[PDB]
Swiss-Prot record, chain D:
GN (gene name): rpsP
Protein name: Small ribosomal subunit protein bS16
Keywords, ordered alphabetically: Ribonucleoprotein, Ribosomal protein
GO CC terms: cytoplasm; small ribosomal subunit
Single Gene Ontology MF annotation: structural constituent of ribosome
Pfam families xref list: Ribosomal_S16
Amino acid sequence: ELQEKLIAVNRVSKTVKGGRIFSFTALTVVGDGNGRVGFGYGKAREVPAAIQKAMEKARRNMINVALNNGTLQHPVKGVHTGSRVFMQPASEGTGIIAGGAMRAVLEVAGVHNVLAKAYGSTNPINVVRATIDGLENMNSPEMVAAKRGKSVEEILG
Amino acid sequence: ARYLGPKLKLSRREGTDLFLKSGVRAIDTKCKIEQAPGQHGARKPRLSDYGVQLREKQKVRRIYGVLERQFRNYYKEAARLKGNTGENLLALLEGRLDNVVYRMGFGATRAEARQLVSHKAIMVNGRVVNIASYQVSPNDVVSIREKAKKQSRVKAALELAEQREKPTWLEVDAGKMEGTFKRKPERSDLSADINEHLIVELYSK
Amino acid sequence: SMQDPIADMLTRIRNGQAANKAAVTMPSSKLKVAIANVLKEEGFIEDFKVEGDTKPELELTLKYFQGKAVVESIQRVSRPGLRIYKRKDELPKVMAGLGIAVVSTSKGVMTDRAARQAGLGGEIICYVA
Amino acid sequence: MVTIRLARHGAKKRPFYQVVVADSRNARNGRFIERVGFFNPIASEKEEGTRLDLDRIAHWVGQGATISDRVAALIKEVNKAA
Amino acid sequence: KIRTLQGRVVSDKMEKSIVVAIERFVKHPIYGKFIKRTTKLHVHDENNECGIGDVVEIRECRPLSKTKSWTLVRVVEKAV
Amino acid sequence: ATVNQLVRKPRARKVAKSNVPALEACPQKRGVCTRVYTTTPKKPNSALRKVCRVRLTNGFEVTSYIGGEGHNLQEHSVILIRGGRVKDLPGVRYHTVRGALDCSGVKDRKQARSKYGVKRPKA
RNA sequence: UAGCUAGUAGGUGGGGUAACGGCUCACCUAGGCGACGAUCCCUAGCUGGUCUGAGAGGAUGACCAGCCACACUGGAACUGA
RNA sequence: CCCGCAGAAGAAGCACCGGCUAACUCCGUGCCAGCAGCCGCGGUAAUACGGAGGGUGCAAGCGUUAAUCGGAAUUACUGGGCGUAAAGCGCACGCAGGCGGUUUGUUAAGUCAGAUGUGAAAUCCCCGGGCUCAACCUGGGAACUGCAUCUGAUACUGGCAA
């Protein structure tokens, strides 16, 4: 019911007095498929422990995003540390059109539409922080009407 | 243009029954399923995100026996059509003449159905068609030609259809051998286990 | 040297929202009042004062529904170095329709939503959402 | 010299003639003023197979448009009265 | 009604003919900027009724030389 | 940026040149094929690559690589030259199409026989 | 490629063309174009269209069609609407 | 195009399998033979070479080469930057050019609305029809984002006057 998904695994080194000592860094995202997303980075000496420490970090770092019956509300930019993530509302887009580390964070959000495009850097670690940043700042018409207009009807035509 | 090969090995690579070898014996019982697509079939590969798209795209193609060139034209026709692309693409595959006769139950397998339609045994609307990829329109009727009727192939196949799921978009009488195509199939009317979500995504790259 | 008096509104409002200022003031004009009247009836600004006899000071008063800003992003479109005009069928929809686009049409200054039922477009003043 | 003639179109062994108003010095499928209808030699009983804009044809013959042999039979074939 | 175009006189010492530049306010095809373009024209008129550097009225007429297919109509807001 | 400067000087495209400057818009050419010899590769590799200089019919003098194991080229026997560099030998920009006018296919090649010009085995 | 142009820019008169027009001659005026690129060099038939591209754009002009120019090369005229 | 005869008889190959990218072992050679679009393999235990088996992809086609676009938001109008990655002229004045505080009247030049002419046909798209289906042909519509004229709107830019 949480729909876990690992994205990428990278091997890093420390270069100590004895020599190179290696370590593994993972990148996982979780999400119930109804509007909640969350990522955990994680790092350990071996791959299964580096994955598992990313299992727990993502669960406690979940954020809530309101969805328009399975798609996002409006087109939005998602700039975060050289990664210019942009997505269009794509009403009934019939399949996730998204790139690397773009599909995993979106299919756990609970979507099957919207087109995506990533500009600038394509680093997996930054773009998954770019997608959540683009998702969280979005507002739906039921709370746009609260902050301005004081009416749900006239703000959407 | 056809497969012409071991049409149970395609089910072993996909890990599910594709109804390529249904026949009289319901349970297969000779497949060695999920353990030998080849020499190294015991091992489980990593199956990356492009792989789950390619296996999903091939699985629907292995079922209906449609090649890549003809299947890609079906996707472009489903893209230009109004509504959901995956719904139209499954409707286009379910509207094929060789598919619908298997849905009528006149063929035990789709390959048997594809051979039956090619041999001028389908007599649709009083107009004989031997094209497997003939897109049947709603409220049409299909029948069996007298020169190919009751020749121990179809009566062995129509008695195999009562253990099937009884499609609700068509009606079969099996006494006059006249099958009608009432409406376009819906998403809930078909198998409902196939995921058309991965199908559209693969053709976008 | 103070080329675009409309973008002077837009940089003061946007900085007024980030600085959590309750009210802002600027030298008023007829066009400055018209856009402020559009923002008044749409829900971005509750009221504005135009006090002044020879040097009117358009005293806008910013609102905050929560600790965040009501005016999320507001941008200048019809810059004096690049004028932008749009037809009735080419009026943009900022933020999937739930964000207005102040347009200077032949009947006056109003939103893109109001201009479409008017059946005529004009100069796209700004994108406020 | 303005003439009303047929333009050979369609696939091989499936001809489709479009009755057109063109100049006699032009080609068969070449430059023309305007088209005035079509004609289907290999037709069916579906709904059609011969259609002409007779009011525009009579407009051209007042300006000296010569009617060629086949369409003159087609003008007789369309049967203005019935 | 005849289509008349405005324009300002550039050169006058041309012996019963005159050079007038027409300014057109056109949009750029790509960048969308409004660049003021200039359209010079040889305009026919009587001997000298308008000086150098003034706005005149131009209409299209029969060609009268290797250039100058446009003639003058009237002179409004004359030179100073 | 600064659109006013753009109307005075538009965006100049990145002009690009091909890696095979032998009669652009042409798949293959033939040459008189003089001086078949060998060349040692660059330092990360070590071999005795069978390379060949080609005097093309257009007047160009270029060197080409002979793919496959063994050839029958000596100072003559006009061959077919196609594009494609080596990334092992500096200067070699082309490849010899085995199975052509005067260069036979590589012997005992059962796999990838469409390349190297090898026909189907008889039985 | 920063200067180009001397029937060249315009005017008067004559001749010429189915027709205006330095189209062509006599005379006079010293004009005319050009930094919103004149002249010079290289290359290229143009367009509806084609391919690609979400779009904007980019490349392209085979086939069908419209226009142009050419008919061994250069030049010239006759017949003929 | 339809009917009759005979029988599965007359009809399947091509590329790839280290990652990018779908697919693995074994044998032989040992920085040799050779592969390779890039990263890079081969140093006597090669999923990268050659062969065998197995598999993957496409299919009367399959690979290679050549050319264009895309990815390339590495020409950024949409849609990039200039402290250290490439990028502030050493500084200043200043012509053309570009932009320009605020109020009123006027103009409608730009802008917008409507109408007319035109934007050939063929081509794209949509709704249908006809070839056994499809390719293909065809009817109608839309489109041809453009240009010109006329009638208005006067909010914004421009001209004029104060």
